[PDB]
Structures are given as structure tokens and as C-alpha cells.
């Protein structure tokens, strides 16, 4: 079972006897298929056996002084004294050392067993929880009934996928005359001047307690529960949440799953079906050419560059359009949206990214996918996009929705009547007191191989996946050099980060190289290393740079809740960032300028 390919053998340095004699004996030894076979009994397969027998020999040829018994037991074996299988238990203690997992293979199964995951959240199986499922299409009304359960509840949760669902809840819980506390990985709002939590809170679902009372929670998205990386967080809150009433919203294709999991905490499961608030079709013809753009279009584009070369070709049209995609922060993502919003506002295109699935109320009145390859994007992913025209909250009141062109219109129409098949299982991951238990058992493996050891090790009910932790990966290799404490180093590699910007890898590393030398991190030295002021850009790429250092002012904020003591500056860093956010605001307002000085200055090849 255990997969041996992921020890990493340590090192065992060398500390009368006639050596060449004692090199027959070694040689004899390792061929014996007796000793092989009884290495195999204890663990040591091939390689095992293999590489602690290299270390062995070694350790045994070059040692100036070997332990007595050890000693004894050679002279005895090479003078007739002793029969050769006499070797074995110390060769086996030698092993144990290389590969100290050998010693301890039961403790690991114990600690990474995974199994019968709601015995985890005692608090929420010694309550009776309800579970209603409320089911239906984006724009169908079943977020809006969950929502107002909550508002009327005399407490409650919302757990949401984005921080700018947390942000809305949190908003308009607060105008509805109910007061609501805030809680996203990079922002705590306590709005009760007597500093105590309100009785509802708004959080990104990652941050919701699970050992909190609550009259009602809401766990919005609940099909991300199957997302590869992220899904453990929605098993966590939908298991754990101590609420009387736990409301979750979303697809169909999530109700067999929900209802296999809550079958095993014998909680009743009601599902509530929500259809449709206003008329959608999808068109006979295709957008086909850039004339044909309407007031209140929005064409969905799958990459960046997609979205570049379109914004330009509608302006040399003599059309502005607004853009949206995931990586603007979220003051100019509510600015775009707002001016394509605004009916009086001449700028009535939308250039966006899949990013606009959700999170973001926008007035659509046609969706045009531009493309369907992302691999062709999957019916869920379509139904939610398209399913954004002809909001019942717009002035919008029907939808329409195509493609770009015409080859792609049956393919769409295709994709979006395809039945969805049921999501299987849900996401769990390791916790922080697990890795640090196998960090006291294997104290020489680095982090990133402690993860995959335990991963080997870790078992799940047919219900359940481990979740993908290559991202956790990837930070506990940059920071690997610095000395940190097991549970410093977990939650550092738990920020998350856009690995593929430089800037925030780099800024990772200085961040946790400053909390290893006890130097806090201050808003005058952040300030100084992010070379404040930085100007407005002048193309694709100076836009990209302002995005990495927003990245890097999240990084330090969501750092900051973690290790006040050496972030200290949030409040700071929070006002810089905001007019940082202020900047890269005018500058994607001036997008088509900067694209046009890409390409045109910079030469850069959108298509
Ligand atoms: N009874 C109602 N009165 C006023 N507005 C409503 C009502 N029902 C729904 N809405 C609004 O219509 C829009 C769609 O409702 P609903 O489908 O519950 O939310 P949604 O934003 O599509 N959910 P999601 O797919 O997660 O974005 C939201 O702006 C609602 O707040
Ligand atoms: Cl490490
Ligand atoms: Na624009």
C-alpha cells in the first residue's frame, strides 16, 4: 500500500575487522533471498531494501568505531561464530533510520484517517440541523429566498464563494435595518460600536465559524463542494455549521451528493425548486460580425488576450465598451460594472470573462459567447453564464443569448440542453493539527513531501476526495529555506496567492523571511518596497505590474489576521491599497489606450 517512491532517504554519516572479509559478508547478505524476503516483511520493498543497504555498507566500510554490539556480532559472523543472518535486526535499525516512516506506518494511518468526516464538528451533531436545499437556475429567485430567511432570522450566516458576495450580503443585511459583521480572509468589519459580533455575519466560506450558534446559515454555490481545491471548505461548512436551519443554494446536480452526506448525519433534507423569474432563449443567429453590437451586449471571452483584441476592435469602431475580468480588484470591478450598468451611460458593451458568472449584478440584455474552448466550457459553466441576461433586478426583462459566430451556435444550443451529470463527492483536505502530528513523527521531511506522505497515507469514505494540494505545494517550496515553525510555515503556505506573478512570489518570501527574523512588517517599509507613488500605466503590461502589487497589499492584509503582532499596519496598508485600487481604476477605464500602446508601441500579438 504505502507508496515508497515518496521517502526521501536521510542521510546516515559513518561514525578489529578485516574489511574485505566484511564486504563479502555484506555483498552475501544483500543476495540472499531469505534477507530480502524478511526486509520485505518489515517494509523495505526493492528500493527500500535497496538504498538502506547501500547506507549500511557505507556506514559499516567507513565508520572508524562502530557500536560494540555491532562489532561483536561482524567479528563472530567473518570467524565462524556467528551465522550471517545475525545481522539482520541492525541493519533493520538501520533502515528505520533512513526511512524513519518505517517506525511509525499505524500512527500515520491513525492520524491521516479521514473517515466519517462529520464526527469532526461535535458541536453541530449533538443539535438538530434542517437542511433545504434550494434548487434552480442563476436568476430564478433561489438565492433571494435563503437570503430573506436569513435577514428574518434573529441570527445567521451567509458563507459565500467571493468576496464580493460577502461584501453585498454585508451591505444590504446592514440597509435592511439588520446588522451585520463582515469576515473575508483580507477584512473583519465589527459594526457594533461595543465591539461584540452582530448577530448575523457575512463571510467568505473558508472564514465561518463552526462553533457559532446560528437561527439560520446560507452556503451559497453549494456545487463548488466538488471544486478540486476549494471544495473542503463547503463539506466544512455544510457539516459544521450550528445552525437550526442550514439553507444551501444552487444547481441540481449537487441534491444527490447532499442528500448521500446527510443521510449520514441523519439530517433531513428539504428541496426547495425555483424556476426562472423572466423569459431567456438563445437566438437562430449568431452575433457574426462587431456591426451587429447592441446597447446592453456582452460578449464572454475565455482569455485575456480575447478580451484585449475585442475592447480594441469595438473602439476603432467608434463604440467604448467596459471590461470585466477575475484578477481587477473590486472597486474597479463594481466601477465597469456600474458604467455599463447605468442605462444613461453611452458606454453600453461589456467585454468580460467568465468571471461575470457571478458575484457582480449586471443589466445583460444578450450574453455572446465568443468562443466555447477554455477544452469546450462545460454545460454548468454555460447555463450560469448565459442564464446572466435578463436579471429579474435589471431593467432587462427577458434574455437573449448566441455566439460570435455561426459554426458555434448548434454547439452551444448543444452544450446548454445536455443533462448535467450528479457531482460524486465532496472535498476534504488535510488540517493544520494533522500535518503538525506528522511533522512530530517525520521531523526531517520538508513540508511539501510531509503533504504527499500524508495524502499516501490519508483514508476517505466513498463520499469523499482529498482535495488538491498543489498550491499549498508550491509555497512551502519557495519558502522551504526559512526557519519557521511547523504551524507558522501551514498557515503561510495557506495564503493564497497568483503564483504566476512574480512580484507576489518574491513578496511572499520577504514576508515570511521579516516574521522568521521577529522584524514586523510596517506600512513605511511595505510602502518604500512597493515603490510607492506608482502612476498611472501607460500599457497591458504597467496594468499587470498594479494587479501583482494589489495582490501583494492582499497578501500582507490577509497575513495581517494572522500575525498581528508582526503585520501591524492593516488599517494602513488597507488606505494605501485603496488608492492603489483608485489608479489601476482610471487605468482599465483607459484600457483601449493601453492596449492600443501595446500593440502598437510595444508590438505585442493579441490574437
Ligand atoms: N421577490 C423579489 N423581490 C425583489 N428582487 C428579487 C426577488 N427575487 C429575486 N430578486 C432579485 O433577482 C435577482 C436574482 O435572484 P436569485 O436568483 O435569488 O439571485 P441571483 O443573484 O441570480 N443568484 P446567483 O446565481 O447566485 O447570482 C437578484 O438580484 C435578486 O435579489
Ligand atoms: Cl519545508
Ligand atoms: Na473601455
Redesign the pocket.
Known sequence: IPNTSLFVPLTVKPQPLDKNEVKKVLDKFYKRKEIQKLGADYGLDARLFHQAFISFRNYIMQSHSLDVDIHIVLNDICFGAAHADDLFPFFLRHAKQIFPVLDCKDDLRKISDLRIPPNWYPDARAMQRKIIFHSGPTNSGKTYHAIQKYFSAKSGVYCGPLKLLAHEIFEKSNAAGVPCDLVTGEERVTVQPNGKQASHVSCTVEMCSVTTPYEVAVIDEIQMIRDPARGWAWTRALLGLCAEEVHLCGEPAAIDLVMELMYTTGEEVEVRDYKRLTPISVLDHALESLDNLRPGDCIVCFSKNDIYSVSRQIEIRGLESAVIYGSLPPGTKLAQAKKFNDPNDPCKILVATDAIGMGLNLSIRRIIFYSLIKEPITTSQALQIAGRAGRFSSRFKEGEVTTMNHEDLSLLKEILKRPVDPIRAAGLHPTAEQIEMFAYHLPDA???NLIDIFVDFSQVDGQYFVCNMDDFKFS?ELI?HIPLSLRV?YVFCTAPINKKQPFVCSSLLQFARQYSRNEPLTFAWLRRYIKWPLLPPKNIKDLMDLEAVHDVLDLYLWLSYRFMDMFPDASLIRDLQKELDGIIQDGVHNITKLIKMSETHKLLNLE
Open positions: 520538508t513540508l511539501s512551502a522551504q510555515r
